[model samples]
Target chain A: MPKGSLENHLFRRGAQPLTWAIRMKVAVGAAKGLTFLHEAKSQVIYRDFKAANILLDADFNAKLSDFTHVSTKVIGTHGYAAPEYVATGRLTAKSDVYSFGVVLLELISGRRAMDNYSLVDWATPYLLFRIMDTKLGGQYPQKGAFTAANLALQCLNPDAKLRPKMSEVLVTLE
Target chain B: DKAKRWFLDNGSIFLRELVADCNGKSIPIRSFSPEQILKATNNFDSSCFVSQDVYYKWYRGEIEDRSYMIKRFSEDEITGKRHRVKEVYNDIVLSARMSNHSNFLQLLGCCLEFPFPVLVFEFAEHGAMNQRGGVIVNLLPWSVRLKIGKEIANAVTYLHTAFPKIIIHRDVKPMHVFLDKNWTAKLSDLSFSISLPEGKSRIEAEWVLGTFGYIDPLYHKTCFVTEYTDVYSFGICLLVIITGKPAIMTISDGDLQGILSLVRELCENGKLDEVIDPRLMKDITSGQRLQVEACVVLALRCCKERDEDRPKMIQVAKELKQIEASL
Candidate 1:
């Protein structure tokens, strides 16, 4: 809604792909936004979290848009919604942890979350962690890729208790 | 202007009758003829055809600028094609009896003047449950999923206890659960919904008909269709809403596996996140985690192997409502 969305930039081929430096910035910024929601005095659930809902300014700063909910209807993005949240239509902090994992997977792997099947459905953690964004053109570090992908896997863990807090995700991304 | 469209035109008899029908404590049985349907759908124009399968063709009809989903008896069953007049009439009668029920997408009326009756019902905008490739199911958030799952349990329970015509919705799944423009869930599809006769507690169906994902596992083994049949199916749907998978899917290649069994194992293994749609997870707070697990636990209860192991639909509905309230 602000200009367009993070999606238009991710799939845009004419421009250079987001570098690891930029992806880290956007992911951390988005994670901090979610942390604020989770930790606020009024503990809010960021029900809709995805590239399309994360608006980027010309300066490349990211803001989680569309966080306000006027509709009582259950809302979420495809392949990005939490399994337990989808399963029970119940909201919990871990739901965002799971979705953040999908977003992190996309940020890391640069693949559709659900088209060929979700990241969880389509690949083993071993295959996923080792693979880096090809668009990075072999420029990124394997050590960092391994750490980031495993972190995504931990977030993807189905049991809510197993997922790390958003504050944890931000710290680990360092 | 679209503004005028919101105001019901008092001139049309359909509108008039609809108003008069809803004015009472009960939704009085209203009838429509072949002529009204023909006018509504422009004589079943191909463009109006919404979908078709072996048994029925659903058409989106517009009469007086108001929308409706008109399902007709189509001779598409290659197995044999004679007008299934009796079944059509049976469906219409059962639907008419429950017109007043709110939990269900109300059956407005049926056009029986034709040899093969055409059913006209409440216009559902978002389309049937378990919609294309399971897209619509994801549209619902965790809270609404809990609400609608309970909403449907109430509908199914109401059918079992409601009236002189104690009905059974033999087919229950996302396709039967519908969403309107408001994005609220309402139950539809009464083609296989039938009555439970007095003194005769259950209907031992000679044949079984249900979407494989939501069918009761024991109907063929025992041939007894009780309120439990709907419970099992409803539970299967509960899993569908919870998992964001279809009522049926082979997540793996061997033995044509059921997500039903897999979900149970994963939940029991404390690995339910493997089964839930990752997208739905982004917003959960720490407190809702227990609430979320309770939903999966409820699904486990609904799909127990033995029918008796399955809890009553009324109790299930109550538990689901409690889940909704807790959230």
Candidate 2:
């Protein structure tokens, strides 16, 4: 099958002059899936949608799994999960979009996952620095890569409503 | 506990009188004679008993052209709580408190003078959802399944929110819900109903009481309960509605074999057709499938492990109404 979750491959396993093309395919596919759930004739708010919760198949098609509720005890994968969900017990589909944004940032930058620096704290400073993984130093598309990072930032908006709907994200990717 | 129970009984009896005095809506409940019940139920003949649980055995009866169900708690089942007078009184009063809902079991009356004290409830044919032959309720169209669920949810919500007190229906499952001869849904068997103070919000505290599959996991663990507990059971009941199966499929082994796991797998797989009972398979066309999907979603939400994740009866009733309104 084609690689999925993209987190592992992009981080350590690494690869390809075609990484940008692969990232684009995964991003759009992810967004369309969320769009279907959020705007369906009857909507389902995907409570959890992180790279680990995502499954990849042959090619880069992505699918969502186990989409509701949480554990107050163990909590969830913090860096890859939503803060409001942890802060309060409430969850909604926008939380899915937020997790997707984190996935996007993981794609643009070669970080394994979120660190002490917030996405804004970490990515904003490195936005212009040819932030495509240092391991791949000097080997990718500067234009599309940085543009994608900015889109990721828009998705990580502190205010949930300001984050573009996954449908709108699909449009932008197209 | 005694004070609370006493208050609930008097309160409902007062409300019963109020509804009767105002609109004459109260069904005439009186001291039915033990002889009449004995003759009707063929003297509690083993064949007359249609169903049972640990505490009570129910017998189907017909008297003078009308249908009835007579229930009496077994002394061994009642155990040390030997007093039968109060036993019959409590259920009759609470059932009356919850009486008169169009789809709820009507407290027809009782025979307190009898040595064992019998309670008579309106008879509902095919009396239980999990009614064994599986041909009747399941054989009906998906529309009936959805309507049955709506009626049950609304009835529980009424018990939780309306009436004189917040009655915590400690048990909610398919078997407790009955279908009248006309096939109208009626919530029966409130033997586990709890009477609690309003406290503005209607969360009741109690030891967990419910069938194995239908008990809320939270209540199952802590034994502290609220209306949320009943909501959890109602969720399982919805599973029965869609799946046309019993709550727990077997006694031992294959712990995951129950309808909950089956429904969860079908929902995750997006296999709506497989989720339906085969009898109603042809009945659910593309047009009616939306309502079925809504119910599936609702059931999944209700079956959530954490109590906080479950939908309240009020919201459930509203959602069911919305789905029912759709084509």
Candidate 3:
């Protein structure tokens, strides 16, 4: 991408801060990409789905990279990986769902998914408004913000089965 | 004490046969104790079992972090058969002598505690050629198949010319070809090999022994074995690799048809592609198509009905090399 990665635009300096609408658009586009992979004929898994792996174009449209097929070998980033996969080393399509949730949470808070402490753990106890990106300066609409936040939290559900498929996630985003 | 007795008896027999067959030239080969073989193969545990054929059972083993294959002679075929025991010794000597060639399966060592010596070979990750699934075999790229064909041809040529007497590998089928981790072909199973007498071009055998479809028609009928016997079998093997069809197939009418006859019929009718493996036909360039045609033509030449009409293994190897280079 001429515009580099979504990771740089979201967190790095010198790049213009993304608008609330553009962030939602990026989320939907990224979800569509994952939906395509999950519903593929051979059924690929985007084992690693993080902002670093999502490229952004000049218009802030998102495209996912770093795809993989089913394998016994446990592979993925620490924070973005599913709890079941991390503990048991058994992977499934829902594992990618958990990873997508982590990316969604990162987009919401504009914070690293893992720093000194885990973002999921730290943000789970707080209200959505309390954890919202301070860069927005309270300009985001209340209902739309809560709807996106609710989706991220549902994706972060402890039970992998309860987490939404990328197809459902794309529909919700759309 | 029991192992000691068996080892002595077997060792004595081994030496007598090796000397008699190799013209008193001591063919040096590493000898492993029964204990090492047992330990390496986990006491012949079922988990260590790799594959089994009519003549031998293969086991995967690791000794001192180095993996190898342990080939034990089948009890049903070996016990109470003195000639079978001699053939085992011949295998040991021939495999040891041919071990220097890269294309031949490398014989690591052997154990002499039993009635028949158990051979150990360098690891071949993919095992025997025909043992894998048809899909897996068919999925092999054309280039890889050509490489395997060329390498096996090279190894056979070496067997025919590199020895003091012309060594005829009576068995040359997909089952005898092994694939190492790098996809390199290793010609194995020299138990059926025989050396032509000092200056003779062919030897009369008491009885013909080879896989049914792979047996040369001339040798099968006349009981006269020659180097061309291997050429015929290798040709059948080439057809199998080309078409992914068995050497012998029962057609729609339930008639047993050899690959040679089937291919000849198809070629004469100008419909050779009808028998060509569909996977091999996929995405082939014009040059690759030409290469495949050349290979099929060469295989037909190798399998001529008259043993004298067939191409030598060296020529077969040369043509295969040329076909591969043209790709």
Candidate 4:
């Protein structure tokens, strides 16, 4: 519990620094937890997935919240919710995939989630390279960054059905 | 108004076919609005596309808590408005007619707002047999293959006897067989089915329509379409499941041959080793081996050149049921 919410470390001024390697570790571990929830016998839908709900240990291994299942009543945090769910109040496992994409984008770029400038749209051409977290000091592999962004784009596809299942997301992360 | 017109146009055919062919049996077909279908499929976005055959493009869709498969007919890919339009209604009518059967894919609902009605079916997690390529098919255990084989045979038999006139499923191939999450075989795609007239064993068609290698040569040479036509195709399907080869395959000599031809050659030459999938070759009980051979023999019998020689779908199903229990 030395590390709190992933968001605390991601955006706090003097918090533990998340290098590209650390961020990837967090991403993969978080994806694993989400995959379990989705593939479990009862299928738990992570209604409010965001960086804050992803808890990190002292060694920075991430674990997702929602040990159980539930939902409804416009059920997701602002800026991290899927458009379909927000618009129609329909919640599905894919809604969490959309949120996971936002968190992935947030991990790649050290920015808070908002769509005013549309973070997903802005990061559309990730090869532009200007969107990378400036603190990484060009330490990450360009190919690796592109792969993460590519997977994130798939998860963030506006069509909820188009989003990869969390098990697929975990495989990609691994 | 256009939606109303499309609805009326599709509804007219659907109702007419129901009354004429099915004796107006009421089926619980849910009518989804355009907005609901659009929302489920994300406005038919390309990314939602799962796969497509010549007639329809399948999109993965989510409505409420459950996921579904939304099938939208590809207008340009089809030929002749008269034929294609009938095919759409035929699909709806037969699917609704046979919806109660466990071996048939359940048609949950449809959307008729578009010019072509969009079909919504319970999602098949493994997709159709052809979509997954050869690996998984090859990996299927002898028991599972026998189960799938028997299930599909039962489905085909149901089609032939469940109505006033024998309904011949003109297309019965690997591409049309789907597997649900439980690996239960679900026979789908009934657009090519046609009913024979009362007291008629066969009818003449102006043209032949079916996948090449699976077509009954008798039916292909002559325009006579009969229940045996589906038996011929199902024979090829049975071979595919048993051998893990396509309807057509390129042999080691690089010559194209039908699975029927190859299996006949192998069986006659006492090289059935080459015919059965090697994945199943590694370890098989003596009892399982006998069942496998029985399936091969039954498949060959069903593929006999003369329609009279081929086993009826019911016979095929009964024999498969017996073979499945042999182990």
Report the lDDT tens digits of candidate 3 across residue range B1-327: 577788889788777876776665654567777777888888786777766677788778877777888888877767777777767778887777677778988887778777667878888776566622222333577778888888988888888888567888677777778888898989888877777778787777665665555666445434567768788778877878878876445557433444565577689896666766876567546677777788888888888755668888888888788776662
Deviating ranges (above 4 Å) for candidate 2: A1-174, B1-27, B82-89, B131-138, B200-206, B250-255
TM-score between candidate 1 and the true structure: 0.55
lDDT for each residue of candidate 1 in A92-122, tens digit (9 for 90 to 100): 6777787788777776666664321345666
Per-residue lDDT of B247-318 in model 1, one digit per residue for the tens?
Answer: 435444322345665776676686755656667678665666677678777878877655677888789888
- What DockQ results do all the predictions give, each relative to the true complex? 0.01, 0.02, 0.00, 0.01
Clashes of each: 27, 4, 0, 0
**Relative to the unseen true structure, what is the C-alpha lDDT of residue B101 in candidate 4, on a scale of 0 to 100?**
86
- Clash count in backbone of candidate 3: 0
Q: What's the true lDDT of residue B276 in model 3?
A: 66
Q: Which stretches of candidate 3 lie over 4 Å from their true place?
A: A1-174, B21-28, B45-47, B131-138, B251-255
Which CAPRI tier for candidate 4?
incorrect
Would you list the clashing residue pairs of candidate 4?
none
True contacts kept of each: 0.00, 0.00, 0.00, 0.00
Candidate 3, residue A43: lDDT: 65
Model 2 residue A34 lDDT score:
68
